[PDB]
Design a protein around this ligand. Structure first.
Ligand SMILES: Nc1ncnc2c1ncn2[C@@H]1O[C@H](CSCC[C@H](N)C(=O)O)[C@@H](O)[C@H]1O
Ligand SMILES: Nc1ncnc2c1ncn2[C@@H]1O[C@H](CSCC[C@H](N)C(=O)O)[C@@H](O)[C@H]1O
Ligand SMILES: CCCCCC(=O)Nc1c2sscc-2n(C)c1=O
Ligand SMILES: CCCCCC(=O)Nc1c2sscc-2n(C)c1=O
Lengths: 340, 340
């Protein structure tokens, strides 16, 4: 009821600390496929048996583990996803979103709401993407974190959008190529380009080779504020526009408009907020995403009306917004050049 | 499913920061019974309209508010409970559990699991109850926080335990008298004593007078390690034993045994953990409670077997464990003197 829901919201930070400890101590990999004894696990992570037991009991209480017998633990399907080696692993995602880099800025949430600018810069001394460009191990974690987040979209997009009419697709800020890989895997004759920062482009180039898509997926690097590489039939921009304030978004959509020319189409893959906020079945709460974008980057999530205006301004019209399955929490906004 | 549950656990800390901001900014009292315009609310808390709007949208997304029209907000039943003036208010509870005093120690959870002792002492420079004895405004908040938590138990205990056979009941560590008040309100001829620290006894004395129970409820102060006042038919100890390590608990139960003498009974009102950890329908997760007791006090939650042993040792036998409604998450453990 009403009181239980409030209690659940209030104790979220303590729940996150329990999950953060599981992730940092690599307990999911320690347990793996079997039933593990707390005493055996205790010698794997430099915690005493009693302390590790209480942590594992909380993880069982939170649906991440099962205590089959006293002191004997197996993973649930949820806990299995924190294994580094799970085929659907979100281990790096879990580490990224529990790192000081992504959590310390939330300690100043009110300042971010007051100033309208990110608190990340205050805590770490530069904007997030500049900071990561100078911290290769955080950059590495971020690339893997966005892969983990994008799995839900990558696994569903090609079943909710017809890619068959296109010869070429360019993913603008396409990360390590998780999204474009999933699309190319379903369309053998389709050709791809990932457009990224030089740093992330290095990760994407290796991913494309590792995935055996080198022959029909290229990687190009640059600055989507400077330009987007031209000549493609379809442009994707996923989980990118929400990183930026309204003016920076127009500048990105402006680079996209030039690339579209006559016969180009843009697919904006992002949260489309309703005009009136309400509870959402998305795996990741879109209003928490909105405030994450504020504190980390000075970005935000947007309604169809807020984006339709930013398109209008870039010389683009929102043609059509297509849904994904409710658990994904992103929509496909088709954008074409404005008739003007 | 599995992935959505993991995502929910990981983003708990950001959800808590949103609720903490609602509580600190007194937004529940600002909105109150009506529909409030974001622009009118913005001039109540020194946030700009846009920033406050995004916070309120997240609160609507988390079930604390309703956006009836764009920029127009009402409380839900859950949000209503954060009003200072709500008859079932947990406002002080919300402020206490989002204060640095109760959250900073969680930043060192692993150290607490490693050392088995509280991280509060390291952060704030003394044990929690000593610290609060020296910080009257935190002591005040704590008294009101425990009242808010105890409402669920106070509203249910007398319907799940027969108090009619007793002439006198003494609440050992009875806080501001929330629990004993609820019992006395249902038993007009029953007499009560609250046994507390001098500091909290001041709060209980005022509460008993305010509630019109002065004529049949007394307040006495001292140290339950020194003694528990004798001569009562029934002793209550609620949310107290979980504050202490096993040896301190035996010392408290030892004071209780002396007070029971021949015809005295003890009711231990606390979490009774199962031997094997699993998800729990309690409004407050008992394993998160366990780790809260570790980081703040070096306490813990206990199984019936763990408590039955600590009783045996105090010269007491666990007679019988009685359930409360599943949402409460506390049980009534009847304890009588050990036959020996
Ligand atoms: N100026 C710029 N030019 C090009 N790419 C940029 C950029 N600034 C940031 N980026 C890239 O924008 C991406 C946003 S994260 C989204 C990654 C991917 N589309 C996914 O959904 O998983 C990052 O990978 C970052 O490297
Ligand atoms: N040495 C001591 N002697 C007596 N009371 C003590 C004590 N140390 C702590 N306490 C009291 O123990 C209480 C534990 S909190 C529980 C309060 C109440 N039973 C409720 O459930 O709401 C506090 O109110 C604190 O003041
Ligand atoms: C319930 C909240 C979920 C938040 C998910 C989130 O923040 N995703 C995210 C982040 S964090 S730093 C950069 C990014 N980008 C590009 C993202 O898409
Ligand atoms: C999901 C976690 C809920 C935690 C509830 C909690 O911690 N209660 C608490 C605290 S905090 S400081 C002293 C105390 N006492 C006596 C308590 O009973």
């Amino acid at each position: 009821g009403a009181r239980s829901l409030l209690m659940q919201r209030l104790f979220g930070s303590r729940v996150t600390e329990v999950l953060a400890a599981m992730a940092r101590l690599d307990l999911a990999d320690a347990i793996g496929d079997g039933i593990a004894d707390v005493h055996d696990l205790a010698r794997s992570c430099d915690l005493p048996a009693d302390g590790l037991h209480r942590l594992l009991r909380a993880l069982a209480g939170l649906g991440m583990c099962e205590e089959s017998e006293p002191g004997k633990f197996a993973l649930t399907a949820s806990g299995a996803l924190l294994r580094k080696d799970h085929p659907e692993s979100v281990y790096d995602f879990a580490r990224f979103h529990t790192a000081p880099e992504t959590t310390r800025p939330w300690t100043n949430l009110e300042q971010a709401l007051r100033t309208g600018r990110p608190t990340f810069d205050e805590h770490f001394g530069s904007p997030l993407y500049e900071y990561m460009a100078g911290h290769p191990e955080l950059s590495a974690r971020f690339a893997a974190a966005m892969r983990g987040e994008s799995l839900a979209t990558a696994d569903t997009i090609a079943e909710h959008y017809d890619f068959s009419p296109y010869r070429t697709v360019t993913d603008v800020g396409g990360g390590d190529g998780t999204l474009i890989t999933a699309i190319l895997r379903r369309h053998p004759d389709l050709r791809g380009t990932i457009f990224e920062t030089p740093e992330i482009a290095e990760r994407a180039a290796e991913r494309v080779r590792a995935a055996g898509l080198h022959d029909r997926c290229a990687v190009v690097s640059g600055d989507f504020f400077d330009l987007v590489p031209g000549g493609a039939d379809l442009y994707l921009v996923k989980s990118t526009l929400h990183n930026w304030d309204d003016e920076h978004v127009v500048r990105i959509l402006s680079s996209c408009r030039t690339a579209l020319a006559d016969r180009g189409r843009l697919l904006v893959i992002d949260v489309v907020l309703p005009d009136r906020a309400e509870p959402d079945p998305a795996e990741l709460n879109p209003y928490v995403k909105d405030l994450q974008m504020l504190v980390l980057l000075g970005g935000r999530e947007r309604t169809r009306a807020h984006l339709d205006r930013l398109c209008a301004r870039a010389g683009l019209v929102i043609d059509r917004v297509l849904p994904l399955p409710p658990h994904v929490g992103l929509s496909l906004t088709e954008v074409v050049p404005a008739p003007a």
